UniProtKB/Swiss-Prot annotation, chains A, B:
Signals that turn on the gene: By glycine.
Summary of subunit composition and partner proteins: The glycine cleavage system is composed of four proteins: P, T, L and H.
Keywords of this entry: Oxidoreductase, Pyridoxal phosphate
Any single Pfam family the record assigns to this protein: GcvP2_C
Cofactor(s), by name: pyridoxal 5'-phosphate
Official protein name in the record: Glycine dehydrogenase (decarboxylating)
Positions of modified residues (N6-(pyridoxal phosphate)lysine): K697
Any one biological process term the GO annotation gives: one-carbon metabolic process
Catalytic activity, EC: 1.4.4.2
Length: 933, 933
């Protein structure tokens, strides 16, 4: 029989998340010549860094039990109506977009468009987002989206320095009306960059000298609308770069800053249907003049042409910044919101918000209350004689107002405000028996409205492009979203075995809580007592992560992997400065590291010294010893990846850490390859002092067409005081007072439920089993493909850790077929191509996660063997190098009905592995060697 | 400027639901030569039946406001833990199925597979459901699903009568252990059929004579497991048909009744992941022996072959029953649940339920409580000395137990029961300080378990087909569901202009509340005080519907259109019997009526008299007068459709009603064409006495691959007392005590939120505008296609109401191309074919709803004109009648890469209207002239 525990099947999610079952795992172990997962892992992972027991995060729970527990936790949050503002407002996300995009795995299970041939649908949505940015800002070049408004302001300052034509100008000016979180992030970035920040009134910049750039907010943090035309003209007369922060919804009604002379315009796209999510993941728009196209940060979608001449979109841009990805899922949400509403719908929403603000202001002023600013769009600043009583009454009414303004309260209206809300506000601020009526006030304000200056009122036409004027029906919008989705190859169709990326399963149980109104719909700057569920969940997650990573503390603020590396380096630098050792600025980086690490080290104000790797990507101790001796007292830290970028479990990592620590240098272990450690080993037990965790890779947070997921960092005890803090929000025991790295205190807090659910559902043994099953899948692919393509960078007994690197260079030499040809030909077999040329050019890195079953691995192996056979045919003279299926891939269905002159058949070209479940690439190969259409 | 009301935009959903905008509507009105919607409608609808004002259901509300109001209503429901049983239990629907199927419009926006070439994906899920039915029941032929277990029992009785080989046997035997709702529905059906029902112990059937069939329940309503092998053998020795009701989850562990000798096995598939939904929409499985294949009710999926010889699935069956459709969406949910769990997972779930029941029973018996039945699977019958105290304690613990058993309480466990629940039950039934421990009881019961007889324990292998053994990963299951979904043509890709079906928009806002746990997860037989939100919502919906239809009362019990017709005819018959006028049994039916009406009239025990239509489908008064005179005192009712089946607003409907009423006959207006009335006219104002409303057609309830949606009926004051009632549930003012027509008191109550949301969001003027816009779209299609294909059955000034009937017979005569060829060729243009040959053979009926925009209508018109040009080419001799794109359609992509011998190009064959957004039919034409593969 079975015990009751076996019948309850706690750990049922372990067998859903891990692809192969017990029999498939046994077959793969037989194929790779290993007795069990424990034996394989113990013969691959070095003995001195092996954990006998996996970190004890708890017993596994079922999806239903975990969801119920998280629902009970989230019910501790209080859903007050928020008028706090400060860059965050409640939105009304259309149910058609929420149903068919946000909760659709075809939209959130894809990664960065490394293959534009299979990503045309999401590329068009990003192009629509760029078109919205161009229309609203009035500039020429728009980015594909940035992390958030504060990071976008930091990038605007960096780009202003890059494009400045003034020597000896190292001062950056910020207007005092800028949102405080933006000011804090800009101050941290300027401290690391060496810039001097001046904060004052906007008009006072003319007094100061040596200013290379200025930051202005179109609408002040307390709601004042500014006309900056004369000041911007005077600034441009002095060759000063002008950047303006603008709200996306306010740009519908207000004059575009680009037409007022702004060089750079950026802001939050959150109000276009993106819920706040306690400061959650939001996209930021970024625009600049055409003369600064070379220095624009981030990625840009461009219009290119096929090998067949068809119009095709691609992500072109790569501008010395550490941004590597964009908030693709949220930017697509904003663009789809714009498409659904149209210019008329967006104008109606903005006019309704402005009219409700005008009605509230007229009522308050009729009842004797004074307003600080006479020009506003959606934010009032009411001067209350008794602030404490007003705040108490608002709390009794379950209404949150901005309470950090001296002798005043702040009300910000949004898309969800109704007349009932305005009546509640009248009751709160004036008391009962005020006697105001919305209709008479409405008639008064519609005729007489002077809250917006005539010059600041928009009069041009926005969103005239046809895509914004033809999908206003729910049926048409649904069909448009489906047509965009059909063009892409997502995880719900095929495996995406990208190296250095963990395209594992984004389970529906992990995705469900992130759309809960208890986790969404929360203002990041709300009083912390109303966010007790978030506090409980984040504390549990931090305890789990410190157990898993072997560290002592965890900070969730960073919202990207590069942001996490930057935050960890900031912690190292602040620790060095706290011991009167600020002269330590040398950051040793192995020659095989990722490109992001030197960028982050340069951002953190660290001199980068490259240490050579002897061979196979293993850094040699003699060169490391010599470099660290040369650094000596000026050695700040080291930046290594374990397992290495070549996916090798090096046997000298402990003595590398010892050598670094011998000279007073910290060890930063990059957590890119953490998917190969969880349960088997931890960076803290290895000896690292600080690391960053890519929850989007190792803990199942999805890539929404890009990878700007959570980047929380784990530190040892001595580095704990120096993790990034926050200024707006103060929470004892969970937030420090250090310079913030993100706009929100906890970054994108509304996707941390994914990691919480994943850890809660797996447990310690589940996580360890997932790691070793991923290792087993990689070794199975390596052992099945060693005779076709040479396997590079093997470990002990010729084994790979979790990535199988295939050597294509000999094949390219004696045939001419490159790794790009194989990557494009895998599309015809129905596969997203692996990573090409990341560690070394001419190679392919295959990283199967634990989530892919043996059937999918066998399909991929069969496709690779068939491609090898095709390369053999190319060598044999059957097909010319000029005309063969490898160089002509991918093949589109328009070719089938045209005249066929190729020496290979249509079936070979288009159905090399069969006709069933055929995915169709929309465009041919993009040479790649920005306007919506 | 704009007023605040214009900025709030109440009625925003009206412009999302209605396809064309104001400019497109003006262009279409110009094309059809009408001044406005009011002018067109007033010139189409006869003056004497026109409503000056639309029925006042209220002002429109936004989607967010309506959702908030419905959430506040649904929060009045109490979510007690239910152990009531009686055929309903809480399920654990896997989040992967809920996310990717239940909330995926690609799964619930399709209709009945009239075109199997575009429905292979859902046909495979229905085939999997049939395979599950065959494996669990042990019989040869399985249906594609029935409405519910009680209706399935009624069909089992009808089929037993059909296949009975005994003359003069008119008695049907029902065992007293059958669920009471099943007994009530069977009694109503037998009263209408003339059968005599005997209810007694199962063994007592041997005493009675003249029995043609017996109904048995494998597990009694109080949980007793029966071994019926000897009794079934003795019954078969007497040529008595044996039907057995079985639970789908109990069949995992218990011996299949088919192997015990049962001729027919049926039951509820609800426990395979389908939430109860207050008795909501559930699928019922139905199986029979191979010798009864001809008399099986409902539809059956069969394995056929293509015109190219490829294997292809199709819905084959049509057995004199009024079932026309199946619960496709719920049956697919059950089949996907079976696929996800596998035989091992299903066995584990059933064994866990049985083990928890055994632990609870052992604890209760150790603590001095007695059990009525020693053999059980998941239901106990605890004999409590103080029933009232136990029930009060259970209510204090928020636990629902079956409370209608004399001197006993009933507990039924399900998939969601845990050890904590069993401990709570111990506290409820034994009090505190009982001292029982789950682990020691578990050890006792695992070793010693006699609650299932050795002969009743299943020992065979179920679900050995490969589809049940290879998709247990979440990734693999997601990819399988996506692969099934990709094969189908749904509303999220193209218009489905089926006549007699209203394939309008199933908005996401209407779909969201049906998955709410407040509306789902409710037991239909829970105490009504815990269902106050349902009561409020249903009362509001009934008031709205009586306003809209011009009637006085509405009953929501019927769960299909045929069920609604049957219920209305039952009301007519009971009214006639209440006035000592039972001899009235003649039901006049026009010769142009649908096929469902005569079936329902025969089911209701009515003699059908056909009255001839003079021409154009308009019934002639002289024949109607003569037929009604001949009927005289025996005339029961009439069954007309307004507008007629040919979509004609007849000008003599008032005098037809007058003629029927002159002889004491009731008027049943079939509500098939109600989409052309709402706001413009109502059947009650016309003069009808009773009608049925297809909420799945006119009020936006989706078709989930089939049309078994709500069929509520509206009646006048005198027929109100005779609407179907319920026996298990008693609610004053909302439920009568008449014979039930469905298992649940309110039918599928968890999809009534769709209709509530639709009406609340549209309002009176919105509904009227939707009706006249649908009329305008039909007239625009008719006016753009009159020169290509003749338009049949025009009204005043040559206008159609809401369906455009195209005459293909001249084209077929002069060319040989049939309406079936055009229907298949429209697939190549990316369209679901219209209705073929419903009113008259050789015609196509196009019904565009108000939801299709002018762009989609223009695309359809262009496709039809291109098809007309192709038929002209066929006539001209360019293409032979044997070899042309019309007769060879649809074209599949496997043809493109094969040798092409056709006289027409590949591009003409496969991309006649372009290459963008190409939907690919999976199979070629199915000739039609049942095993999973």
């Amino acid at each position: 029989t079975q015990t009751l525990s076996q019948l309850e099947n706690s750990g049922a999610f372990i067998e859903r998340h891990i692809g192969p079952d017990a029999a498939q795992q046994q077959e793969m172990l037989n194929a790779v010549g290993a007795q069990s997962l424990n034996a394989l892992t113990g013969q691959i992972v070095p003995k001195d860094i092996q954990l006998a027991t996996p970190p004890q995060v708890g017993a596994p729970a079922t999806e239903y039990a975990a969801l119920a527990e998280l629902k009970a936790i989230a019910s501790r949050n209080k859903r007050f109506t928020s008028y706090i503002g400060m860059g965050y407002t409640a939105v009304q996300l259309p149910p058609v977009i929420l149903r068919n995009m946000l909760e659709n795995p075809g939209w959130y299970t894809a990664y960065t468009p490394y293959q534009p041939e299979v990503s045309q649908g999401r590329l068009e949505a990003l192009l629509n987002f760029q078109q919205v940015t161009l229309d609203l800002t009035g500039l020429d070049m728009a980015s594909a989206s940035l992390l958030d408004e504060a990071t976008a302001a930091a990038e605007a300052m960096a780009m202003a320095k890059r494009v400045s034509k003034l020597k000896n100008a190292n001062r950056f000016f910020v207007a005092s009306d800028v949102h405080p979180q933006t000011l804090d992030v800009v101050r941290t970035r300027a401290e690391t960059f060496g810039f001097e920040v001046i904060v004052d009134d906007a008009q006072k910049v003319l007094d100061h000298q040596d200013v290379f750039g200025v930051l202005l907010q179109q609408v002040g943090t307390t709601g004042e609308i500014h006309d900056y035309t004369a000041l911007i003209s005077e600034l441009k007369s002095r060759k000063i770069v002008v950047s303006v922060a603008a709200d996306i919804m306010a740009l519908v009604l207000l004059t575009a800053p680009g037409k007022q002379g702004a060089d750079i315009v950026f802001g939050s796209a959150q109000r276009f249907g993106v819920p706040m999510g306690y400061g959650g993941p939001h996209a930021a728009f970024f625009a600049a003049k055409d003369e600064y196209k070379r220095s624009m940060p981030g990625r840009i979608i461009g219009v290119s042409k096929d090998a067949a001449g068809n119009t095709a979109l691609r992500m072109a841009m790569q501008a010395n910044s550490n941004i590597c990805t964009s908030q693709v899922l949220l930017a697509n949400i904003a663009s789809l919101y714009a498409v659904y509403h149209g210019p008329v719908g967006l104008k109606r929403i903005a006019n309704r918000i402005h009219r409700l603000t005008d009605i509230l202001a007229a009522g308050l002023q009729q009842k004797g209350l004074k307003l600080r600013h006479a020009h506003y769009f959606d934010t009032l600043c009411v001067e209350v004689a008794d602030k404490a009583g007003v705040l108490t009454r608002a709390e009794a009414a379950e209404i949150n107002l901005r309470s950090d303004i001296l002798n005043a309260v702040g009300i910000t209206l949004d898309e969800t405000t109704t007349r009932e809300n305005v009546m509640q506000l009248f009751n709160v601020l004036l008391g009962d028996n005020h006697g105001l009526d919305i209709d008479t006030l409405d008639k008064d304000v519609a005729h007489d409205s002077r809250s917006i200056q005539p010059a600041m009122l928009r009069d041009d036409e926005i969103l005239t492009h046809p895509v914004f004027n033809r999908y206003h029906s729910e049926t048409e919008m649904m069909r448009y979203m489906h047509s965009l989705e059909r063009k892409d190859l997502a995880l719900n169709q095929a495996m995406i075995p990208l190296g250095s990326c963990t395209m594992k399963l984004n389970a529906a149980a992990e995705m469900i809580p992130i759309t809960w109104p208890e986790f969404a719909e929360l203002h990041p700057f709300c009083p912390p007592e109303q966010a007790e569920g978030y506090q409980q969940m984040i504390a549990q997650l931090a305890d789990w992560l410190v157990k898993l990573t072997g560290y002592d503390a965890v900070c969730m603020q960073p919202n990207s992997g590069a942001q996490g590396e930057y935050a960890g380096l900031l912690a190292i630098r602040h620790y060095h400065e706290s011991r009167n050792e600020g002269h330590r600025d040398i950051c040793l980086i192995p020659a095989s590291a990722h490109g992001t690490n030197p960028a982050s080290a340069h951002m953190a104000g660290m001199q980068v010294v490259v240490v050579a790797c002897d061979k196979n990507g293993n850094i040699d101790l003699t060169d490391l010893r010599a470099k660290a001796e040369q650094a000596g007292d000026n050695l700040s830290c080291i930046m290594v990846t374990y397992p290495s970028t070549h996916g090798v479990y090096e046997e000298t990592i402990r003595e590398v850490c010892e050598v670094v620590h011998q000279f007073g240098g910290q060890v930063y272990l990059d957590g890119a390859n953490m998917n190969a450690q969880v349960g088997i080993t931890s960076p803290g037990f290895i000896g690292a002092d600080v690391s960053h965790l890519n929850l989007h890779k190792t803990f199942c947070i999805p890539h929404g067409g890009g990878g700007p997921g959570m980047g929380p960092i784990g530190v040892k005890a001595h580095l704990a005081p120096f993790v990034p803090g926050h200024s707006v929000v103060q929470i004892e025991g969970m937030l420090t007072r250090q310079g913030a790295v993100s706009a929100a205190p906890f970054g994108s807090a509304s996707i941390l439920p994914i990691s919480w659910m994943y850890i809660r559902m797996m447990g310690a043994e589940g996580l360890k089993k997932a790691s070793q099953v991923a290792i087993l899948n990689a070794n199975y692919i390596a052992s099945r493909l060693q005779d076709a393509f040479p396997v590079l960078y093997t470990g002990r007994d010729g084994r790979v850790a979790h990535e199988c690197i295939l050597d294509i260079r000999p094949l390219k030499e004696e045939t001419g077929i490159s790794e790009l040809d194989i990557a494009k030909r895998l599309i015809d077999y129905g596969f997203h191509a692996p990573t090409m040329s990341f560690p070394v050019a001419g190679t392919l890195m295959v990283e199967p996660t634990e989530s892919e079953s043996k059937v999918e691995l066998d399909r991929f192996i069969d496709a690779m063997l068939a491609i090898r056979a095709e390369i053999d045919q190319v060598k044999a003279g059957v097909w010319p190098l000029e005309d063969n299926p490898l160089v002509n891939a991918p093949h589109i269905q328009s070719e089938l009905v045209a005249e066929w002159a190729h020496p290979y058949s249509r079936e070979v070209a288009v159905f090399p592995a069969g006709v069933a479940d055929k995915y169709w690439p929309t465009v041919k190969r993009l040479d790649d060697v920005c306007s919506c259409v």
